[PDB]
Amino acid sequence: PQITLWKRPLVTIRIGGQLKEALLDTGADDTVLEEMNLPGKWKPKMIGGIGGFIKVRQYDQIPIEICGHKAIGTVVVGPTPVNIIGRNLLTQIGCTLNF
Amino acid sequence: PQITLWKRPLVTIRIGGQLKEALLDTGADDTVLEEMNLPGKWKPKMIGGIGGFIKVRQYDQIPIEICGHKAIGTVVVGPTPVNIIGRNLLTQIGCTLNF
Numbered sequence: 001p002q003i004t005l006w007k008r009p010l011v012t013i014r015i016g017g018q019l020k021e022a023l024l025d026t027g028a029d030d031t032v033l034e035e036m037n038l039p040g041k042w043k044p045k046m047i048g049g050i051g052g053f054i055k056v057r058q059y060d061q062i063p064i065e066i067c068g069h070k071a072i073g074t075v076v077v078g079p080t081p082v083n084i085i086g087r088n089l090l091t092q093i094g095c096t097l098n099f
Numbered sequence: 100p101q102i103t104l105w106k107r108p109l110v111t112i113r114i115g116g117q118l119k120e121a122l123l124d125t126g127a128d129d130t131v132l133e134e135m136n137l138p139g140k141w142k143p144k145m146i147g148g149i150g151g152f153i154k155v156r157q158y159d160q161i162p163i164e165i166c167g168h169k170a171i172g173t174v175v176v177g178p179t180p181v182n183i184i185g186r187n188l189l190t191q192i193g194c195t196l197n198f
C-alpha cells in the first residue's frame with residue numbers, strides 16, 4: 001500500500017490478543033508500545049526524545065502483525081502516549097519513504 | 100528518491116544558506132530543529148514528545164529545501180535530540196510511506 005502523510009500514519013497491529021493502533025514511524029529506531037503486561041523475560045532500558053527519557057521494558061523476538069504483514073523482533077514497553085512501529089520492524093514489512 | 104529504513108533516514112536540508120542534516124520523521128506532526136537563529140517574528144509555543152513537553156520558538160512560512168525538494172512552512176526551534184522533518188513539510192515534498 002501507499003500511506004500519505006496528510007494525517008498520522010496510524011495502522012492496525014496485532015500483538016497477541018491485542019489489536020492496537022500504531023504509528024508507522026521512520027523517526028524511531030526501535031518499536032515502542034504502550035504499557036501492556038507481556039509474558040516472558042525482559043531487560044530494563046531508557047529511551048529518549050523530545051521532552052527527555054522514559055523507562056521501558058525490552059522484550060526480544062516478539063511476533064507482531066502490522067497491516068497483515070508478519071514481523072518478529074524487539075519491542076520496548078512503557079508509558080509512551082502512542083504505539084510506535086520503529087525501523088527495526090518497518091524494514092521487515094518492506095516499508096520505504098518515497099518522494 | 101526511494102529511501103529504505105535499515106539506516107536512519109537522514110538527509111541534507113538547506114535553510115538560510117546553511118546546510119544541516121535532518122531526520123525524515125513520519126511520527127512527527129511538526130518540524131523541530133535544534134537551537135539556531137532564524138530571521139523574522141516568532142511565537143513562543145510548547146510541544147510534547149515521548150519524554151514530556153518542551154518550549155519552542157515557532158517560525159511560520161520558512162523555506163527549507165529538503166533533499167532537493169522545496170517546502171515553505173512552519174518550523175519550531177527548541178531542545179530536540181536531532182533535527183526532525185515532520186509531516187507538515189513531508190507532505191509538501193510529496194513524501195509517502197510504501198510497503
Ligand SMILES: CC(C)CN(C[C@@H](O)[C@H](Cc1ccccc1)NC(=O)O[C@H]1CO[C@H]2OCC[C@H]21)S(=O)(=O)c1ccc(N)cc1
Pocket residue numbers: 025027028029030031032047048049050081082084086122124125126127128129130131146147148149150180181183185
Ligand atoms: C524525536 C525522534 C528522533 C524520536 N521519536 C520518534 C518521533 O517520531 C516521535 C513519536 C511520537 C509521537 C507522538 C508522541 C510522542 C512521540 N515524534 C515526535 O516527538 O514528534 C513531535 C514533533 O511533532 C509532534 O507530533 C507528534 C509529537 C510531536 S521518539 O518517539 O522520541 C522515539 C525515541 C526512541 C525510540 N527508540 C523510539 C521513538
